Design a binder for this molecule. Structure first.
Ligand code: MN
Ligand code: MN
Ligand code: ZN
Ligand code: ZN
Lengths: 805, 72, 93, 113
């Protein structure tokens, strides 16, 4: 009847309005995270047994707060009652209310909670990580309700895009405070659970956006002072959001309040080792895995990933004028220099040089090279520069006047044109027509293309999923060999190319590859395994035919980088390029029937095939730093015997100092490259392949995990789902048996062909139509929440008649 | 007919560039902008007005003696 | 300069970040302004403050690297100038 | 649903002690993770207050592994023997999830007051 409604409201705010039927339930689609003994996943299920009431604000207007009430059994009733009685005093628990009503002649029990919010955090996280712009109604409602935007904003089409409409960051960042408060109240909930002696597993689908918690249904009780919270899935699923919405932006104000001035850090202070641990203890107190503020203390590669992931987030709070090399005044032959004696990354903490020799007597040729390539001496003796054309952090000016470089138009070969028009070509209405021309560019063309690095944002990665995608991508590369090679074995083509800055003032690469005997090069390559050498990259424009008027800019890295990177990587690089029948197809020619062999390779044994391909919009500049780091780690993994563990870490640090944040010398003044690959280094064409395979595996993982595991009919793939979730989140160490299992599943139902980001995939289709493998929308979702680019469906094709390739 | 316009815009920009027109940044910016719009045009009539605008730049100076160069 | 030695002595370890040496010891500042609107907010008048110091404007030049006097850069006269203006200044004490 | 640990693992006995050489014969009980790629016990269930080293010879018998233990946990159960206060000892470095599994199994199949 109606006494139900006046019973539910209880004591406070009896402004109850039914939000459906009466004494019956209310079924809605919500995103859970289920793992019982029969099903895993992070998928939208059908929540049924709950009657939802909405409160009325004054003036008779509907307010954003609800009174849910479940209806379930009798043992869960008392169990819930006891656990709530124990957990009531915490501020981060929503007020329950247990009562018995009657529908027919029986006291059906209820849990009439109070003052909810319509959505949990699980809906927010799912909708951001599983985007589909065709139907994003839940995201629209969640955005409008919390005053982040207004409904009139969504009439501006391509609103969701990141390249177009770059203002959407300002819309998303308005959700930071709610998420930060959720983090804090989760910490307080964990403290209450521990001190109360309760053992339980935490999910996001039991936390309204305000911060409170509920559903103490599957908890168990232990002795007080000895409880344990389980937070592996919660934090790891929530990781990618904390940099979409900048949830830690309120940590740079004077007393962490948004209505205060900014903290003014000291100029010279660069350590920030205590602050990182304080942040970790405040927000991630119960993440029971050691977090090393500086990664030079890490034990192996996976710990380096696990600590770089946290440093990425914690480095966006500290000022960007303290990062970079940490120079030191060194006396040589009675003269003070300024030379780099370390580094300070955002993703690896502080790294110190091991072999530094102040009060040196004389400099060898190796010393002269390693001192004429460091930006410290250059920048520390140049005028300041404040460039308002760009948003990238400028550093200094080496000269007194900037230089403007233009791009000339290509010339005309008239005789061929006359011959063409003689033979009845270029007639109006013909299919063949001129479209590829030599475009021209005005004075400020170089800097207007360097400015595109503004599409690079500090991104967090789902670490407990990357620590498995990296295993599978690793298994994809177990067919080849690699190792360090000596100076007398490197193979270099075209020895008369430029030597970078400032070496291009004296001669081409031949001179520097010539003056060093076969012992100087090895001395340098063994020096870099215990030191860090920052370098200065030049930026040049290409002059080639094209169909689009945008310029193309390529980075000419200095010789001191590629000279050692060749020795480090060349064995593996030339073992990849000399293999036929693999996934990567670098080196396989299309002449003499190679293309036919490739196409018949990728059609291998799939059952109901359907082609699918793609390419990435601005692949080099939209690259996050974590995926670059992981790609370099996967490439350097093969050195299990030739190098130690400190040597491998210092080589990785050198790579990050040379191709990830190196001081680009664009024009006539140094800038700071924020992130992304520089396309003119030694291992671009293979790092891109590693990236592409990583995205493919991530799409497969997301597509298989996020499926309702009660409709899947083939038993084996359901067991695959369950074990996949188990080894992803409920586990900590690699399980090579299941890694082999999943890799076999992939290569049997997802065939691939890869070059540097230009891929082709042949997939079983009657599975992809049931979401057991990656479709072409899954790559859109992954690129959205991980690469920060929206994949337009005018660049991804899909083909179904295999007779045409 | 438009292909002839694109080709003549290419050669016109080349002769303008070797006439040392890029010493004044604004003029070179206007010229390169017009040339890019001519090359990307899909129809003939706007190509021709941008063409005459681009040719007026060459006619403006005195470096290209026209009466001799027009020898028929 | 003695300022570089001064800021290198005050470090706890003698190692200071690279991105603060020019910021706190440079004797000349270069600005690049794309349009008059940005010029008004930053390099307004013969003195301006950046990096918590005092600078005086000197030798304003345009893209063609020809000297432009300060009175010319008005609102209405702006469309008659090459407009990556490079405004130089020196550190005042 | 997100359940803690479906099904329990098992119970056995093992050896422990106070130092490296203080490892006497069977003096505790261990719940173990049954993995095909090796053997891994979870928790040391004992009556003596200050055990600090535990030991178990390798399956080959040539080697033997020492397992350091964290500070103990105080709990009791109900049995025909009456109030019988044991100390739960965890291997050092045990992660939260396995603590949850062992504690859930203990509270499920064994009484506590
Ligand atoms: Mn729940
Ligand atoms: Mn429940
Ligand atoms: Zn670590
Ligand atoms: Zn090696």
């Amino acid at each position: 009847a109606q006494s139900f409604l006046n019973r539910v409201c209880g004591v406070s705010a009896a402004r109850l309005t039914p939000c459906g039927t009466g004494t019956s339930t209310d079924v809605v689609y919500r995103a859970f995270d289920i793992y019982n003994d029969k099903v895993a996943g992070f998928a939208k299920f059908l929540k049924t047994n709950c009657c939802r009431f909405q409160e009325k604000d004054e003036d008779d207007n509907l307010i954003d707060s609800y009174f849910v009430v479940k209806r379930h059994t009798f043992s869960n009733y008392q169990h819930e009652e006891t656990i709530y009685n124990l957990l009531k005093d915490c501020p981060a628990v929503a007020k329950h209310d247990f009562f018995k009503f009657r529908i027919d002649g029986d006291m059906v029990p209820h849990i009439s909670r109070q003052r909810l919010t319509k959505y949990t955090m699980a809906d927010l996280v799912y909708a951001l990580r599983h985007f589909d712009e065709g139907n994003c109604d839940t995201l629209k409602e969640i955005l409008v309700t919390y005053n982040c935007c207004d409904d009139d904003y969504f009439n501006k089409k391509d609103w969701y895009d990141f390249v177009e409409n770059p203002d959407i960051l300002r819309v998303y960042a308005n959700l930071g405070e709610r998420v930060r408060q959720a983090l804090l109240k989760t910490v307080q909930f964990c403290d209450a659970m521990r001190n109360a002696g309760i053992v339980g597993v935490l999910t996001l689908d039991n936390q309204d956006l305000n911060g409170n918690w509920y559903d103490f249904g599957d908890f168990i009780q232990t002795t007080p002072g000895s409880g344990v919270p389980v937070v592996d899935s919660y934090y790891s699923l929530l990781m990618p959001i904390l940099t979409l919405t900048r949830a830690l932006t309120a940590e740079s104000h004077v007393d962490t309040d948004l209505t205060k001035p900014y903290i003014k850090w000291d100029l010279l202070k660069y350590d920030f080792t205590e602050e990182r641990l304080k942040l970790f203890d405040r927000y991630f107190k119960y993440w029971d895995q050691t977090y090393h503020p500086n990664c030079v203390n890490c034990l192996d590669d996976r710990c380096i990933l696990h600590c770089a992931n946290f440093n990425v987030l914690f480095s966006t709070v500290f000022p960007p004028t303290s990062f970079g090399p940490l120079v030191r005044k060194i006396f040589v032959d009675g003269v003070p220099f300024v030379v780099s004696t370390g580094y300070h990354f955002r993703e690896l903490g502080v790294v110190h040089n091991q072999d530094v020799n102040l009060h040196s007597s004389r400099l060898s040729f190796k010393e002269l090279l390693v001192y004429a390539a460091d930006p410290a001496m250059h920048a520390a003796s140049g005028n300041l520069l404040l460039d308002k054309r760009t948003t990238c952090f400028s550093v200094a000016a080496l000269t007194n006047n900037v230089a403007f470089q233009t791009v000339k138009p290509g010339n005309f070969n008239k005789d061929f044109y006359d011959f063409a028009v003689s033979k009845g070509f270029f007639k109006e209405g013909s299919s063949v027509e001129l479209k590829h021309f030599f475009f021209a560019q005005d004075g400020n063309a170089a800097i207007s293309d360097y400015d595109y690095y503004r599409y690079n944002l500090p991104t967090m990665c789902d670490i407990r999923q990357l620590l498995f995608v990296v295993e599978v991508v690793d298994k994809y590369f177990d067919c080849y060999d690699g190792g360090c090679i000596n100076a007398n074995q490197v193979i270099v083509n075209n020895l008369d190319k430029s030597a970078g800055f400032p070496f291009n003032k004296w001669g081409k690469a031949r001179l520097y590859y010539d003056s060093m005997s076969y012992e100087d090069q090895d001395a340098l390559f063994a020096y870099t395994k215990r030191n860090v050498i920052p370098t200065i990259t030049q930026m040049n424009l290409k002059y080639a035919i094209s169909a689009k008027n945008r310029a193309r800019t390529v980075a000419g890295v200095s010789i001191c980088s590629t000279m050692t990177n060749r020795q480090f990587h060349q064995k593996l690089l030339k073992s990849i390029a000399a293999t036929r029948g693999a996934t990567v197809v670098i080196g396989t020619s299309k002449f003499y029937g190679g293309w036919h062999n490739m196409l018949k390779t990728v059609y291998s044994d799939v059952e109901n095939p359907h082609l699918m391909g793609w390419d990435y919009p601005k692949c080099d500049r939209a690259m996050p730093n974590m995926l670059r780091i992981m790609a370099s780690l996967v490439l350097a993994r093969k050195h299990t015997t030739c190098c130690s563990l400190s040597h491998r870490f210092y080589r990785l640090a050198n790579e990050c100092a040379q191709v990830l944040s190196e001081m680009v010398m664009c024009g006539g003044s140094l800038y700071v490259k924020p992130g992304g690959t520089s396309s003119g280094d030694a291992t671009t064409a293979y790092a891109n392949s590693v990236f592409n395979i990583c995205q493919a595996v991530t799409a497969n993982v997301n597509a298989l995990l996020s499926t309702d595991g009660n409709k899947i009919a083939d038993k084996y793939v359901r067991n695959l789902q369950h074990r996949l979730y188990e080894c992803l989140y409920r586990n900590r160490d690699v399980d090579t048996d299941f890694v082999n299992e999943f890799y076999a599943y992939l290569r049997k139902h997802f065939s691939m062909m890869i070059l540097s980001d230009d891929a082709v995939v042949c997939f079983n289709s009657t599975y992809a139509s049931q979401g057991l493998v990656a479709s072409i929308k899954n790559f859109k979702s992954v690129l959205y929440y991980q690469n920060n680019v929206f994949m337009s469906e005018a660049k991804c094709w899909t083909e179904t008649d295999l007779t045409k390739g | 007919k438009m292909s002839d316009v694109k080709c003549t815009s290419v050669v016109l920009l080349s002769v303008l560039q070797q006439l040392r027109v890029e010493s004044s940044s604004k003029l070179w910016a206007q010229c390169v902008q017009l040339h890019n719009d001519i090359l990307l045009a899909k129809d003939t009539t706007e190509a021709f007005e941008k063409m005459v605008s681009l040719l007026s730049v060459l006619l403006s100076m005195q470096g290209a003696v026209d009466i001799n160069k027009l020898c028929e | 300069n003695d300022a570089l030695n001064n800021i290198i002595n005050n470090a706890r370890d003698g190692c200071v970040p690279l991105n603060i040496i020019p910021l706190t010891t440079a004797a000349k500042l270069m600005v690049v302004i794309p349009d008059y609107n940005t010029y008004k907010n930053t390099c307004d008048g013969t003195t301006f403050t950046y990096a918590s110091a005092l600078w005086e404007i000197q030798q304003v030049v345009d893209a063609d690297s020809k000297i432009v006097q300060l009175s010319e850069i008005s609102m209405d006269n702006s469309p008659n100038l090459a407009w990556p203006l490079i405004v130089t200044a020196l550190r005042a004490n | 649903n997100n359940e803690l640990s479906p099904v329990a693992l098992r119970q056995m006995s093992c050896a422990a002690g106070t130092t490296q050489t203080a490892c006497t014969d069977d003096n505790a009980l261990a719940y173990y993770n049954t993995t095909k790629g090796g053997r891994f016990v979870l928790a040391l269930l004992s009556d003596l207050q200050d055990l600090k080293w535990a030991r178990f010879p390798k399956s080959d018998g040539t080697g033997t592994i020492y397992t350091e233990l964290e500070p103990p946990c105080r709990f009791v159960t109900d049995t025909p023997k009456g109030p019988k206060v044991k100390y739960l000892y965890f291997i050092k470095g045990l992660n939260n999830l396995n603590r949850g599994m062992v504690l859930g199994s203990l509270a499920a199949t064994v009484r506590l007051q």
